[PDB]
From Swiss-Prot:
Protein name: Peroxisome proliferator-activated receptor gamma
Family the entry assigns: Belongs to the nuclear hormone receptor family. NR1 subfamily.
One GO biological process term: signal transduction
Disorder association: Defects in PPARG can lead to type 2 insulin-resistant diabetes and hyptertension. PPARG mutations may be associated with colon cancer. Obesity: A condition characterized by an increase of body weight beyond the limitation of skeletal and physical requirements, as the result of excessive accumulation of body fat.
Entry's free-text remark on domains: The 9aaTAD motif is a transactivation domain present in a large number of yeast and animal transcription factors.
Cross-link for Glycyl lysine isopeptide (Lys-Gly) (interchain with G-Cter in ubiquitin), residue positions: K21
Shown residues within the full chain: 235 to 505 of 505
GO MF term list: alpha-actinin binding; arachidonate binding; chromatin binding; DNA binding; DNA binding domain binding; DNA-binding transcription activator activity, RNA polymerase II-specific; DNA-binding transcription factor activity; DNA-binding transcription factor activity, RNA polymerase II-specific
Gene that this polypeptide is encoded by: PPARG
Sequence motif 9aaTAD, residues: 250-258
Tissue specificity field: Highest expression in adipose tissue. Lower in skeletal muscle, spleen, heart and liver. Also detectable in placenta, lung and ovary.
Activation/inhibition comment: PDPK1 activates its transcriptional activity independently of its kinase activity.
Species assigned in the record: Homo sapiens (Human)
Subunit structure: Interacts with FOXO1 (acetylated form). Heterodimer with other nuclear receptors, such as RXRA. The heterodimer with the retinoic acid receptor RXRA is called adipocyte-specific transcription factor ARF6. Interacts with NCOA6 coactivator, leading to a strong increase in transcription of target genes. Interacts with coactivator PPARBP, leading to a mild increase in transcription of target genes. Interacts with NOCA7 in a ligand-inducible manner. Interacts with NCOA1 and NCOA2 LXXLL motifs. Interacts with ASXL1, ASXL2, DNTTIP2, FAM120B, MAP2K1/MEK1, NR0B2, PDPK1, PRDM16, PRMT2 and TGFB1I1.
Length: 260
């Protein structure tokens, strides 16, 4: 209810530490890759079909779609370990830990995706590649239209100009949302988020002290995320059943066997 400001500072730096350990490609590292001047640091830019074939690390848009699906699985493992480091998380009912992560990973993936994006494209692989926004938008339906809304949210979110020490607490606040459906013990979850919200508010005042009501803007983006993500998972499920389930395309299988 009323943590001391020193306690909130320690909580913030503990979260920053585990954030650095779980997520190797921080926003700071991604920004430096995006502005490097050498070819050694340079990510290979994929801007059309020929450039994509040269990058070594619908066959194409489905491979791209399944490529990001795999990266989200790796992100979940990293988010789960970071969530285990939030003080008091592992003391909750094991099913509430699952519920909180179940609804939370999709919102965190959207947020951390902004860390890899600018107005022109997105860092992919582990910073070794860069896919342009217009290439991904050009992908045949429904892939082109499924990926563009991520860019549209990122340029808004990145305008808030948050760093890793900010995102560490923001991600934790998302995870400890007491109003997820199906939660058993709500009060202990809210008691943790009350402390994280205090720690978040203090961090956004020490950082960005000229920035007016950044705490409020960030909270509004957070609830915006939930509606955005509900639509994202629903269309993602549609795409996974009508486009990547080869058992539903028996004639494409015959083509593949007859041509390859
Ligand atoms: O970690 C990575 O290398 C990485 C990781 C993710 C992307 C990327 N995913 N994505 C999706 O829409 C997406 C897809 Cl297509 C399938 C499953 C899940 C997602 C999700 F991340 F949104 F949740 C994008 C859209 C626009 C731009 C970049 C990306 C890109 C790179």
């Amino acid at each position: 209810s009323h943590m001391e400001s020193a306690d909130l500072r320690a909580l913030a730096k503990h979260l920053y530490d585990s954030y650095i350990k779980s997520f190797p490609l921080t926003k700071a590292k991604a920004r430096a890759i995006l502005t490097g001047k050498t070819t050694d640091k340079s990510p290979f830019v994929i801007y059309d079909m020929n450039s994509l074939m040269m990058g070594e690390d619908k066959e194409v848009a489905i491979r791209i779609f399944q490529g990001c699906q795999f990266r989200s699985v790796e992100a979940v493992q990293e988010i789960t370990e970071y969530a285990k480091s939030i003080p008091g998380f592992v003391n909750l009912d094991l099913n509430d830990q699952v519920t909180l992560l179940k609804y939370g990973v999709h919102e965190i993936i959207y947020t951390m995706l902004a860390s890899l994006m600018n107005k022109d494209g997105v860092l992919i692989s582990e910073g070794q590649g860069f896919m342009t926004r217009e290439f991904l938008k050009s992908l045949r339906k429904p892939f082109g239209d499924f990926m563009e809304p991520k860019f549209e949210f990122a340029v808004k979110f990145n305008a808030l100009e948050l760093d890793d020490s900010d995102l560490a607490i923001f991600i934790a606040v998302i995870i400890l949302s007491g109003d997820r459906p199906g939660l058993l013990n709500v009060k202990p979850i809210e008691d943790i988020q009350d402390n994280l919200l205090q720690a978040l508010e203090l961090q956004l005042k020490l950082n960005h002290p000229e920035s007016s009501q950044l705490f409020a803007k960030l909270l509004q983006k957070m609830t915006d995320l939930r509606q955005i993500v509900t639509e994202h998972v629903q269309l993602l499920q549609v795409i996974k059943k009508t486009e990547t389930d080869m058992s539903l395309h028996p004639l494409l299988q015959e083509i593949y066997k007859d041509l390859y």
